[PDB]
Design a protein around this ligand. Structure first.
Ligand SMILES: C/C1=C2/N[C@@](C)([C@@H]3N=C(/C(C)=C4N=C(/C=C5N=C1[C@@](C)(CC(=O)O)[C@@H]\5CCC(=O)O)C(C)(C)[C@H]\4CCC(=O)O)[C@](C)(CCC(=O)O)[C@H]3CC(=O)O)[C@@](C)(CC(=O)O)[C@@H]2CCC(=O)O
Ligand SMILES: C/C1=C2/N[C@@](C)([C@@H]3N=C(/C(C)=C4N=C(/C=C5N=C1[C@@](C)(CC(=O)O)[C@@H]\5CCC(=O)O)C(C)(C)[C@H]\4CCC(=O)O)[C@](C)(CCC(=O)O)[C@H]3CC(=O)O)[C@@](C)(CC(=O)O)[C@@H]2CCC(=O)O
Lengths: 209, 209
């Protein structure tokens, strides 16, 4: 056979974002949130995810604000962390994920949680005005919420986009319910994911393409 | 507030796979393919993806066959590669991805393709009975198909699960149309993804949990 497919990524990129814009309904989204929406949709191939996207009044502004002023991303997974295209970061923003950190399994044990959650303890001195990215683990999100309630230092924003069938749904609305003084963004419901999260990060740290 | 969420991953894992089995329709799937289906669904939070899953008669058998006999996974992305839980691999199967390889951008240039595709050239001496994993890039899939047509050495199987709005759809059915003598597995349509792919890999390299 003779394959007549496109071999130019930017071309691909151009017609990809194009097809999407042409299909996803992005009306209620802020000219800036939209960007977020479309790559998110891009990364997942689902034009409907948009249905669940939810950004606190100033989420984009304040995170894009911070991700621009240097603020570190704190990924709950590594898929997410490896979805962030360094080449697109405003100011070499750190993509941190202590999931596979040597002391997380033990923090999980003594405190009684999950690696993804205990991991947040290693975040202890990096919450300060940062952009949290949890696109894989709701316990992490719930744990992050307790910290805050118990006198913790509010991050710059909170990407509550973990994906799941157990706990993700609640963790996320809980973020929305009482986010202890910080903006958020979540994909309410079961949907979420490293791709969408990273995609969202990618959108934030640099609009368009 | 007082959060009453579950902090035990295996518990989470137990009720996650449980909720799914309880919701996804897995009838036409092979008792073994099913496993694949459910984690895939797990990784994405979409019970419907199953609708698009498609495995060539012997895909599972021959890849699980190979992934068991040592056969290397050749990831087209790094998200996918970082979704493979080493802890679950049959025999330390290599998770290879030459996307971020120093010579790919140049292979893309001289031959006129995309990194993800030219990258496959670095696969040249690893196609031999291997399990290809393309959960991010259809040009890679199309390119892989040309190689085969032009006298290339058939991989052990082919995970045609790239996700996309341009080319992914065709690349995938093309895999199905003429896969040059090798089994496949694709998520027909736009859906696919590193998670689902990796999830699928994870399922293959070790059933259940
Ligand atoms: C960043 C990125 C890249 N994608 C590449 C691989 C690019 N993708 C592709 C595709 C078809 C695609 N991509 C995707 C997603 C993401 N892709 C992304 C993400 C994070 C974008 C977002 O949503 O924010 C998202 C996955 C979120 C995460 O996993 O967390 C889709 C799955 C949606 C897919 C679909 C396109 C379509 O068919 O419409 C390309 C065009 C080729 C494959 C093919 O044609 O089949 C490739 C570049 C090249 O090879 O020249 C990459 C190296 C591109 C670049 O040069 O800028 C860059 C990583 C740079 C680096 O290593 O730092
Ligand atoms: C492998 C894996 C892990 N997931 C962990 C992080 C585990 N997940 C979780 C979740 C809530 C989840 N997970 C997911 C997916 C995958 N998860 C996977 C994948 C690849 C499974 C598959 O589909 O094949 C898939 C993502 C495919 C890819 O990205 O390519 C979902 C997104 C579906 C999510 C949903 C669960 C639910 O709510 O129903 C756990 C339970 C905690 C977070 C929370 O409760 O909020 C965590 C372990 C722990 O902390 O004890 C991990 C370390 C688990 C382990 O110990 O075995 C292991 C990686 C080991 C390693 O580092 O090698």
């Amino acid at each position: 056979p003779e394959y007549d497919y496109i071999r130019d990524g930017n071309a691909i990129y151009e017609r990809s974002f194009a097809i999407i814009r042409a299909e996803a309904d992005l009306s209620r989204f802020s000219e800036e949130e939209a960007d977020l929406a479309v790559r998110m949709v891009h990364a997942c191939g689902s034009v409907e995810a948009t249905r669940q996207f939810v950004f606190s009044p100033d989420f984009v502004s304040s995170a894009r604000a911070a991700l621009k002023a240097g603020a570190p991303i704190l990924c709950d997974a590594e898929m997410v962390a490896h979805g962030v295209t360094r080449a697109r970061l405003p100011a070499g923003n750190e993509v941190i994920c202590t999931l596979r950190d040597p002391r997380t399994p033990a923090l999980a044990a003594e405190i009684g949680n999950t690696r993804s959650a205990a991991a947040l303890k290693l975040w202890s001195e990096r919450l300060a005005g940062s952009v949290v990215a949890i696109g894989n683990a709701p316990t992490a999100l719930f744990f992050l919420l307790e910290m805050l309630r118990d006198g913790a230092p509010k991050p710059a924003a909170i990407l509550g986009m973990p994906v799941g069938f157990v706990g993700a749904a609640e963790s996320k609305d809980a973020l929305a319910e009482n986010s202890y003084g910080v903006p958020f963004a979540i994909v309410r419901g079961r949907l979420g994911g490293s791709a969408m999260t990273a995609a969202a990060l990618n959108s934030l740290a640099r609009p368009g393409l």
